[PDB]
Amino acid sequence: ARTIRIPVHMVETINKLSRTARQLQQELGREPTYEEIAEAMGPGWDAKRVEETLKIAQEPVSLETPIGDEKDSFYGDFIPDEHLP
Amino acid sequence: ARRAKARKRLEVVRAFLDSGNRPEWMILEAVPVLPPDLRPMVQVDGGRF
Amino acid sequence: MEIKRFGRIREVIPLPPLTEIQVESYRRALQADVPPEKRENVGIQAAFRETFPIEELVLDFLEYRLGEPPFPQDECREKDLTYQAPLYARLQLIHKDTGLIKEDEVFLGHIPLMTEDGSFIINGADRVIVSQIHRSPGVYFTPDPARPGRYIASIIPLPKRGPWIDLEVEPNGVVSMKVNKRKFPLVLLLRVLGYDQETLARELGAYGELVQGLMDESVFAMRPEEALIRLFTLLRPGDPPKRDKAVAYVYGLIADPRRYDLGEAGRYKAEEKLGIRLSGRTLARFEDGEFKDEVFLPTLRYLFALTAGVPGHEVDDIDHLGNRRIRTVGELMTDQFRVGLARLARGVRERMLMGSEDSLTPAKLVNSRPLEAAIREFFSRSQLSQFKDETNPLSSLRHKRRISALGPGGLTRERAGFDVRDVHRTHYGRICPVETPEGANIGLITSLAAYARVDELGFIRTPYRRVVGGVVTDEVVYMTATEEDRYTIAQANTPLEGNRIAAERVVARRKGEPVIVSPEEVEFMDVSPKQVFSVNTNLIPFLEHDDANRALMGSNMQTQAVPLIRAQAPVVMTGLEERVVRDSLAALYAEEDGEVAKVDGNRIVVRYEDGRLVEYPLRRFYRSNQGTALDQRPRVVVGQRVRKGDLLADGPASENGFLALGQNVLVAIMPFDGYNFEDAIVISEELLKRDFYTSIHIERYEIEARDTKLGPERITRDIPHLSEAALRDLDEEGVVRIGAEVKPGDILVGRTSFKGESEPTPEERLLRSIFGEKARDVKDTSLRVPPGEGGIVVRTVRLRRGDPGVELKPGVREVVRVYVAQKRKLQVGDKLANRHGNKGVVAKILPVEDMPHLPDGTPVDVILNPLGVPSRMNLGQILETHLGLAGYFLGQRYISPIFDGAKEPEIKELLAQAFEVYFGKRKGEGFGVDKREVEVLRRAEKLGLVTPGKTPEEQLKELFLQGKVVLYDGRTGEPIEGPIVVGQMFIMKLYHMVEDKMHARSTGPYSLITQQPLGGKAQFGGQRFGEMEVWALEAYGAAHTLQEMLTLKSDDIEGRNAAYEAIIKGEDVPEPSVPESFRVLVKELQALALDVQTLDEKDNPVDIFEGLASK
DNA sequence: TATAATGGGAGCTGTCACGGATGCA
DNA sequence: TGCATCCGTGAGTGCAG
C-alpha cells in the first residue's frame, strides 16, 4: 500500500495507535495528546516514542498536488532543488 | 472505397519499410524506467517527503 | 459639521441584517439552541433522520447535542486551531432477533462554529462560505434544439441526490426516456408502475397524435413484475436479473428517498408546476408490495398537451430567478454532512456482519472518522471555502454576500456560456447588475441585492409596497421572482401626495418589461432605488451619472481600500456609510443606556442603568488576513452619558461610525505637464506631511526547529561566523527584541541545523587548517528578512513543546513567530481610486510650491487629468467634486441618495452660498479683483463661460457655479489660461502598492526536474519568458538574446554556472550548450519507448549526455 | 492454520465546435 | 454510395496563488 514500504510488524503496531487513540478520543470529547496515548498504550510507551512512531506513519505527498482552484500550478514547482550546486 | 483503405494501410507498411522499424515493436516486453532524479522523492522543509 | 440631506423618497423598511444569509442559514442547520424535542427536520437533524436507522441487528438514532467550544474565538486564531464544538449523538442498538438494548452517546468529532459576523475559523484563519447558485430541483420543459416542434422534458433533483432524466418524444411516435444516458421506450417503465393500456387513454385520451403512439403491446403482454425484469436488462448489460436485484436497482434510483431527493424546493416547484400534491420528495413509492407512481404520469401529461398546443403549457426559462436558487452556507455543509453520515453507515453495517453479532454497543460500532473527514474537507479545500477578505470591513461584509455559480454542484468554467452570466430580467432587485468581476468569472460570481433575502426554499426575494386604489400601503411583502411577474409594479420614485399616487402616468414594470400605466392599474411599488444594487454599488454617490462599466470598478475597488491611519468618511455620502460600519460588526456600540466609567487605548468600561459594569476590551492593532492593521480606537470620554446604540469605538476605516474608505482631498482637474498621462496621478507633497494616505501593515514571519536524522535544529543566539553587530538586536535565545528596527538581510531568529555527509570535504578541511578554527559542526539557518521587506518588531510568539498547553506537528521541537510592522506613507507607484472607477498610480509628488493653487494661497492636493472622463463616461466624479467645492467652504458634508439625490440646481444653489465666503471674505479684507483673474476672465468670455459686461465678482460668481475657479501655476505665478474645475473628492488608497510588487533576481532557486528558475516574488522567482515573449524576440531576430533566454538565463546548467563566473571575472559570457530541460525531453520519450536521437550532418549520432548514459 | 462463509458499487449531469472513423436505408 | 453519429481534441498572456 505505502509508497515507502514499512515492515509488516511496524504497520501492525501503527494501526494499534490508530485504534487505541480513536477510543481515547471517543471517551474524551477531544483528540488525545501524545501522553494520553503512551498511557493507554501501556509499558515501554512514553510520549517521545508515540511521536517518532507517527512521524514515520507519515505518507508522502504528491509533487503534482494541485495548487489553487484553477490548476495552472503544481506544489512541486514551489520546491527548490538544493542538490545541484 | 477498397482503393482508399489499401492506401491508408499501405502508408503504414511503407512507414515501417522505409524507416526500418519492426511492427512487433509496438508491444513492449521490457518497459523502460525513467531516471529517478526526473521523478524524485524529496524531503520538503518539514522533513516530509 | 452640518450634514445636509437630499432625497424625497421616504423609504418604508430599512436594510435588513446584512449578514443574515450567512448567520440565519447556519443556525437553521445547527439548532444548537433548540431543545432537541423541539427540533425540526431540517439541516443537521434531517441528515441523521435520513441515514438512520442502519439495517441487517439495527442501530437507531435518538438525538444529537452540541457542546461549547474547548477554546474561545481568539484562542483558536492564535494557536492555529479551529473554532468548533464537540458533536455527541445518542444511539440505541437493538437486535434484529432477540430484543437487545444498549444505549451510549458516542462522540462524533468537532463541528466548526460561525462567529458573530458571519465568518469561520479553520486552523486559525478566518474564512467565508460563499453561497452557491445552481439550477433548482424541479421538472422543466424546454424546446428541442433539433425538432422545432418537439420539446424535451427534464426531471432534475438536488445535486448528487438522484439522476437526471429526459422524455424526448422521438421521431418514431412513441416517447423515450434517458437515465445515465441510456435511452429506451418510456412505456416499458409505466408498465412497472402497475399501469394498464386503458388507464392511459383514460388519462391521456385527447392526443390521438401520440397518446395512441405511446402504446406498443410488445410491452403490454406482461404483468407489472414482468417488465420489472425486462428493463433491468436494459440498464445492466451483464447482471443476473433476479427479482431481488431488480426491485433493488430501480428503487435505489427512483423511489428510495435515500439516494433520490428532490429538493424540499423541488417538491413545491414540481407540485405547482404539474398542479399535484406530492407525498414526499421522491419520484416513485414502494407501498403494498409494488410501485405506485407519483411524478411520471403528471410530467408525461404536461409534455404531451404541450407538443399539441394546449393552453397553460409554457416552456420554462431555466435562467429565471424562480428556476434558479441559492445553496446557502448551512445547506452547503449539511450536504457534506449527509455524505460523512452515509460513509459512517458503510462502517457500521460492515462491523454489523463481521466480528461478533451479540457483544456490541453503539460506542464501538461507530468509527467517527468518515464524518470528521468530510467536515474537515468542506471547510479546508472546497471551492466555496475562501480565505476571508478582511482588507477593510467592507471587504468582509461584501464577501459574505457573494454568489458563485461555480463549485462542487454547479458549473465548471468550461460549462459556463452566456445565459448563465447575462443579467436576467428577474435579477431586478435580487442580484446586483453591477457588482461582479471583470475577467473570466464575469457573471458567475455576483452579489446579493441590498434589500433582498433568501426564503426557506433557497430563492431570492425582494420587497415591494402594496398599492390599493392608488394609495400606497405601509405593508411590505417580499416576492419570489415568479409571483412578481403577476403584477404591475410602480417605480421607486413615482411621485406622491401624502401616500397617494399623484401622477397620471406612472412608470411601472409588468414581467420586467417597462409599461406606462395609470394609477388605477398599479398593484405594487418598489421600496427604494437602493433595492436594485449591491451594498458596494449603493456606496457610489451620483450613481445615475456613471456609465455601468465603471460603476463596476468603483464598486469592486472599494473592497480594496487599505485602512488609513487618518481615515475619513466621504464628504458626499449615500446613506449606507453607517449601517455598513454597523453590520460589519467592526465598530463597537452601546448595549443599553448608561454612563461611561473608564476609557483607554486598551479598554472601555461602562456602568449601565442595570448596575452591570461591562468591560468592552479593544481589539487594538490586530493583523488581518491581508496584512492590513485591523485597529479599534475609542470615541468616548470619561462619564460620557450614552443612550442605547450609540458608539464607543471606531473600527478600522470608520470615522465616528461612517465607512471611511479613504480621504477627502482638494482635487484639481487639469493636464499637468505629462504626469497625468494615461490615468497617472500627481499629488501634493503636502499629503505625506499631514500623514494623509498612510497605512500600517504587518507580515508574519514563522520558523520551526525540528528533530532530525542528523540532530535537533536549535533556536540559539549562537550562529557561527556572525559578528555581534549582526546580532545586536537578538535576545539571549535568538529572537529579535520587541521594538527593534529590522531591514533586509537582518536576522530575525537565529537557528542551527547540522551539516551533512558533505561534512567538510578536503578543499574545505584545508582552508580551516590554516585559520586555527576547525570545521564547525552546525550551520547558520537563521530566518533573515526577505528583499524589500521590514519594519519594527511588534511582538514575538515562541511555542516549544515541553511547555504547557502546547503540542505541535510530530518531530518539531519549537516554532517561533515574529510579527513585524511598517508605517506606509504614500509613495510613487501606489494605486489610488475613487468611487466612480477613476483609478490611477501616483506618478509624481510635487512639493507644495509647484501645486496649482487658488488666489488665496491654498494649494491643491491631487491633479487628476480630464482625459480620463470623456471616453470613460463616469460623470459622477464630476458632480461629486462640484458639491465638494461648496462643502469645502461652507464646512458641510452631504448625503446624496442614489438615484434620489441632489440635482444640479439644488447644488449650484450651494455653490453660490460658498462663493460668498471665498470672495466676500476678500473684497472686505482689503483686496479687490486681481490682475490675473481678469486675464482669465477675458478668456472665459471668449469661451462663453461668463456674460460679458458684468462686474468681475458677477463673472467669478458665474464661473464658480460652473464649479470652476482661477488657478495660478505655482511654478510661475502666472494663471492657468483657463478656469479649472477644483473641488473636494473622496479617494481611497488601494491595496496594490509598489512596495509589495517590486522584485528582481539575478540568479536564485531552480526547479527539481527542469532546472529552470522558480517563479513568484516569495520564492525569489524568475520572470516567465513565455511562448509569446519568444515570438517577440523571434520577430526582432535577436537570435543571441533569445538563445540566452533559453540557455544561460534559464537551465543550461553548464553555461549558466559558466556565465556568472564570466561576469564576476569581467569576461564575456560563453557560447551555450544544450538546455537541461531538453535532456528531460529525451529521457521522457525513452520512458515511453521512443528512441529520440541527436545526429550530425553525416547522420551519425551525437551524445548530448557526454557518455554519462552509455556503458 | 479448520463451525460456515462462494458475482461490486457508484455513477453526476447546464460548453462547443471540428474533424475524422464507424454504422446503416 | 451518401449521410447520421460517436469519440477525442482543442479552447490567450504574465502576475498574485
UniProtKB/Swiss-Prot annotation, chain A:
Q: Where does the source fall among the domains of life?
A: Bacteria
- Quote the subcellular location field of this record: Cytoplasm
User: Which residue stretches belong to region Sigma-70 factor domain-3?
Assistant: 12-85
As for what it does, the entry says: Sigma factors are initiation factors that promote the attachment of RNA polymerase to specific initiation sites and are then released. This sigma factor is the primary sigma factor during exponential growth.
Free-text comment on this protein's domains from its UniProt entry: Contains 4 domains, connected by flexible linkers. In the active conformation, the domains are in an extended conformation, each making extensive interactions with the RNA polymerase catalytic core.
Report the sequence similarity comment from the record: Belongs to the sigma-70 factor family. RpoD/SigA subfamily.
Summarize the subunit comment: Interacts transiently with the RNA polymerase catalytic core formed by RpoA, RpoB, RpoC and RpoZ (2 alpha, 1 beta, 1 beta' and 1 omega subunit) to form the RNA polymerase holoenzyme that can initiate transcription.
Q: What is this protein called?
A: RNA polymerase sigma factor SigA
Q: Which organism is it from?
A: Thermus thermophilus (strain ATCC BAA-163 / DSM 7039 / HB27)
The shown range, given as first to last of full length, is 255 to 339 of 423
UniProtKB/Swiss-Prot annotation, chain B:
Q: Which family does it belong to?
A: Belongs to the RNA polymerase beta' chain family.
Highest taxon, organism lineage: Bacteria
Membrane-spanning segments: none
Q: What does this protein do?
A: DNA-dependent RNA polymerase catalyzes the transcription of DNA into RNA using the four ribonucleoside triphosphates as substrates.
Summarize which stretch of the complete protein this chain spans: 487 to 535 of 1524
Spell out the subunit comment.
The RNAP catalytic core consists of 2 alpha, 1 beta, 1 beta' and 1 omega subunit. When a sigma factor is associated with the core the holoenzyme is formed, which can initiate transcription.
Q: What is this protein called?
A: DNA-directed RNA polymerase subunit beta'
Curated annotation (Swiss-Prot), chain C:
> Which key words tag this protein in UniProt?
DNA-directed RNA polymerase, Nucleotidyltransferase, Transcription, Transferase
Could you give the subunit structure recorded for this chain?
The RNAP catalytic core consists of 2 alpha, 1 beta, 1 beta' and 1 omega subunit. When a sigma factor is associated with the core the holoenzyme is formed, which can initiate transcription.
Name any Gene Ontology BP term.
Answer: DNA-templated transcription
Q: Which InterPro entries does the record match to this protein?
A: DNA-dir_RNA_pol_bsu_ext_1_sf (IPR042107), DNA-dir_RNA_pol_bsu_external_1 (IPR019462), DNA-dir_RNA_pol_su2 (IPR015712), DNA-dir_RNAP_su2_dom (IPR007120), DNA-dir_RNAP_su2_hyb_sf (IPR037033), RNA_pol_bsu_bac (IPR010243), RNA_pol_bsu_CS (IPR007121), RNA_pol_bsu_protrusion (IPR007644)
Q: What is its EC number?
A: 2.7.7.6
NCBIfam families, per the entry? PRK00405.1 (NF001616), rpoB (TIGR02013)
Q: What does this protein do?
A: DNA-dependent RNA polymerase catalyzes the transcription of DNA into RNA using the four ribonucleoside triphosphates as substrates.
Q: Does the keyword Nucleotidyltransferase apply?
A: yes
Please state which protein family the record places this protein in.
Belongs to the RNA polymerase beta chain family.
Gene source species: Thermus thermophilus (strain ATCC 27634 / DSM 579 / HB8)
Q: Provide the reaction this enzyme catalyses.
A: RNA(n) + a ribonucleoside 5'-triphosphate = RNA(n+1) + diphosphate
Q: What is this protein called?
A: DNA-directed RNA polymerase subunit beta
Asked if the record carries the keyword Transcription, the reply is yes
Alphabetical list of Pfam families matching this protein: RNA_pol_Rpb2_1 (PF04563), RNA_pol_Rpb2_2 (PF04561), RNA_pol_Rpb2_3 (PF04565), RNA_pol_Rpb2_45 (PF10385), RNA_pol_Rpb2_6 (PF00562), RNA_pol_Rpb2_7 (PF04560)
**According to its record, what are the GO cellular component terms?**
DNA-directed RNA polymerase complex
* MF term (GO), any: DNA binding
Signal peptide range: none
